[PDB]
């Protein structure tokens, strides 16, 4: 009658009930998304409420068992997972108050309005048109009015709500033995083990700092090149030494630089590789797309995909009166059912997206064997990284030549490789400083180091010092710029993107090493190599049973994140940028401002 027997029995009961509950909830949500109506959303709500009630009751029931006496690793892992007890600690009235804050914030973000100053009648919402204006336009004032209006209409409303939100979240964090909310978020990567695999909550800050210090020079050179190129389109506004103005970065918040490609092509004459026309030539269809992707995945070594996938999944946008949301996604309903939903057209982007989704499905299929509470990835970043590897491997010219889309006589030229590297860099390298700065600001705000009076002063100082972006119009303390982002208003963490971008290239480097590839890393292809598939499967099978440090050790041979492979990936770009920036200035100075 030891507590182990007692816990083991409880766990068994939970496992067999939760499976049946979760399947019902997921099935309801799927038919809602496939088939839209009032009955469907009502059914979703009923099933979700039932599932949440069961989970809450079970969690409250199991807070009872002492945890220290458990001497088995897996059982201890499961019990710790079931005993989170996050937000139930707060009292009822405060819980309601916080819930109404979250609902009001989401509603205000969803239904925002901004209006032109010249023409008051024209008012646009963010998703239908502000994004179109920001992605397409090339006029200074047109971009400036949108950038200013969005903030002036949204942040003023959002800030007082955010004040109570941070206060109440800090209170709940303190109530459950954490110093601050930032510690609560950082505890996701926290794990306790026995022999050299432990990880502390504080070590994450130091690791991120060390990685950023190494990544800085490439960002400096890319910043200089973009400044020089943009000097042509906007002659008067951009200064040779100063930071780039905020509203010309290609999107609303400057997160991505992918839209700046047309202005910054190094070699405009030679065109990028696209095989859409070859696809239409050979009369391909969506099932042809998915069959080719499955062929690649069986070539590497992973299994084929189940018959229920072909029978039940939606692979094309359906006709009739039926209305379907067009966002691509991958589903793991449970109890052996796997489906993929996406509207597939004949394009290269659809090809790559299909590869990415099937990748997620392969991960889900692999770790299905483990107990219910452990059916997830090692951490947040692994799930996206695994998918990214396959797309990167699929995009190579050699694979396209092998499958039959490109003519055999075609051969690669250095200009095309440089263009491809720059396009990839504008998306991957540029996003790191933004995420790092946003996470640092949020952490400092939560801990209390940054007083309430100087939030915006600190925000823009950090932007100038780290990212290299200067505000167009001076902003007072009434505004709340960070709340403009979707993630901040909806309460999600943001460090996952940094972590994923770091791990992806480590995985690729290891697999390419195993597969005996000679040359630059960016030409790697993992097709027709069973060893790499087996090595990846060994990590995939583990799931959440063992530390993620152990998972990384299995594949790459190191216990911590390392940034050297990322630098190795973009070495030719580094040399070319060094050659090109001979006469230009490198670095930025903080004094200059557009408003002067």
């Amino acid at each position: 009658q030891s507590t182990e027997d007692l816990v083991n029995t409880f766990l068994e009961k939970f496992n067999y009930e939760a499976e049946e509950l979760s399947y019902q909830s997921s099935l309801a949500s799927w038919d809602y998304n496939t088939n839209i109506s009032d009955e469907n959303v009502q059914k979703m709500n009923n099933a979700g409420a039932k599932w949440s009630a069961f989970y809450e009751e079970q969690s409250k029931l199991a807070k009872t068992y002492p945890l220290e006496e458990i001497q088995d690793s897996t059982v201890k892992r499961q019990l710790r997972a079931l005993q989170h007890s996050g937000s139930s600690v707060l009292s009822a009235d405060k819980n309601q108050r916080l819930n109404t804050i979250l609902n009001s914030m989401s509603t205000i973000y969803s239904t925002g309005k901004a209006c032109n100053p010249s023409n008051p009648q024209e008012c646009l919402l963010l998703e239908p048109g502000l994004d179109d204006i920001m992605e397409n336009s090339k006029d200074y004032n047109e971009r400036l009015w949108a950038w200013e209006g969005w903030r002036s209409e949204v942040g003023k409303q959002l800030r007082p709500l955010y004040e109570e939100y941070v206060a109440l979240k800090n209170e709940m964090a303190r109530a459950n033995n954490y110093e601050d909310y930032g510690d609560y978020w950082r505890g996701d990567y926290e794990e306790e083990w026995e022999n050299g695999y432990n990880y502390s909550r504080n070590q994450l800050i130091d690791d991120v700092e060390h990685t950023f210090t190494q990544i800085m020079p490439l960002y400096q050179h890319l910043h200089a090149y973009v400044r020089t190129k943009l000097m042509d389109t906007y002659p008067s506004y951009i200064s040779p030494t100063g930071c780039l103005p905020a509203h010309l970065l290609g999107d609303m918040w400057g997160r991505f630089w992918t839209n700046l490609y047309p202005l910054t092509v190094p070699f405009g004459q030679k065109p990028n590789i696209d095989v859409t026309n070859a696809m239409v030539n050979q009369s391909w269809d969506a099932r042809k797309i998915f069959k080719e992707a499955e062929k690649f995945f069986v070539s590497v070594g992973l299994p084929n995909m189940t018959q229920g996938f072909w029978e039940n999944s939606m692979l094309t946008e359906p006709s009739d009166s039926r209305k379907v949301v067009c966002h691509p996604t991958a589903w793991d309903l449970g109890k052996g059912d796997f489906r993929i939903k996406m509207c597939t057209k004949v394009t290269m982007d659809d090809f790559l997206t299909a590869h990415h989704e099937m990748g997620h499905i392969q991960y889900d299929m692999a770790y299905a064997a483990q107990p219910f509470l452990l059916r997830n990835g090692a951490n947040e970043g692994f799930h996206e990284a695994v998918g990214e590897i396959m797309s990167l491997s699929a995009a190579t010219p050699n694979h396209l030549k092998n499958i039959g889309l490109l003519p055999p006589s075609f051969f690669e030229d250095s200009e095309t490789e440089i263009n491809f590297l720059l396009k990839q860099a504008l998306t991957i390298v540029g996003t790191l400083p933004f995420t790092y700065m946003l996470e640092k600001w949020r952490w400092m705000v939560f801990k209390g180091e940054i007083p309430k009076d100087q939030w915006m002063k600190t925000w823009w100082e950090m932007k100038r010092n780290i990212v290299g972006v200067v505000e167009p119009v001076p902003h007072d303390e009434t505004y709340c710029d960070p709340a403009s982002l979707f993630h901040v208003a909806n309460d999600y963490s943001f460090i996952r993107y940094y972590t994923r971008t770091i791990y992806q290239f480590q995985f690729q480097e290891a697999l390419c090493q195993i597969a005996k590839h000679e040359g630059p890393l960016h030409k790697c292809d993992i097709s027709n190599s069973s060893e790499a598939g087996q090595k990846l499967l060994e990590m995939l099978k583990l799931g959440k049973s063992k530390p993620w440090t152990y998972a990384l050790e299995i594949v790459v041979g190191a216990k911590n994140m390392d940034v050297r492979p990322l630098l190795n990936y973009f070495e030719p770009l580094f040399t070319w940028l060094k050659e090109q920036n001979r006469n230009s200035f490198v670095g930025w100075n903080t004094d200059w401002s557009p408003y002067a």
Binding site: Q1, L6, E12, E20, N312, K335, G336, D337
Partner: protein, 195 residues
């Protein structure tokens, strides 16, 4: 003039749960096992001990058939000297068992939209069952030292639980129907050999 009720069992609209398995005795009739054997419609027929070749004339005293239904992943659990929930607490085979076991998929009849919750099996028990034993008891299982006093609660669990079959499930979770043919091995005249 009596014939073996081979077809009567097959066309049954419902099969009993594993814990309350049905035993039907074969008597005063002769059934051709060769046609069943030659069909090979079943994927899973793997049985050992008795050689199918030139072992058909050695006579058996009597033939027994037991029918129950389980999940696909547990179809291997029905084999001698193996351990798991179904084998230990629901159906056990002796180490020296001589015979064969037949299983076939039954997705279409059993599965229903919205789930089929009639089917039952047992989770927890005090001790392992010894070969060829059946328990129907629905007494509450007590794990802790505290007396249960006949009501479910803390450290008190109901013994039985439901299967939940749905048509869209995977191969592993689909229902499979298992029927076993047990031939008694004793030194006995064995009058009706039933070749």
């Amino acid at each position: 003039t009596n014939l073996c009720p081979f077809g009567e069992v097959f066309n049954a609209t419902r099969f009993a749960s594993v814990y309350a398995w049905n035993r039907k005795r074969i008597s005063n009739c002769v059934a051709d096992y060769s046609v069943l054997y030659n069909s090979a419609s079943f994927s899973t027929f793997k049985c050992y001990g008795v050689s199918p070749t030139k072992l058909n004339d050695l006579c058996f005293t009597n033939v027994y058939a037991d029918s129950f239904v389980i999940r696909g992943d547990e179809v291997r659990q029905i084999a001698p000297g193996q351990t798991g929930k179904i084998a230990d607490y629901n159906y056990k085979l002796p180490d020296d068992f001589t015979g064969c076991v037949i299983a076939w998929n039954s997705n279409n009849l059993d599965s229903k939209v919205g789930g089929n919750y009639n089917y039952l099996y047992r989770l927890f028990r005090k001790s392992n069952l010894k070969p060829f034993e059946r328990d129907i008891s629905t007494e509450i299982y007590q794990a802790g030292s505290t007396p249960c006093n006949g009501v479910e609660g803390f450290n008190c669990y109901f013994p039985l639980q439901s299967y939940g079959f749905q048509p869209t499930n995977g191969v592993g979770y689909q229902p499979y129907r298992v029927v076993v043919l047990s031939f008694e091995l004793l030194h006995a005249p064995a009058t009706v050999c039933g070749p």
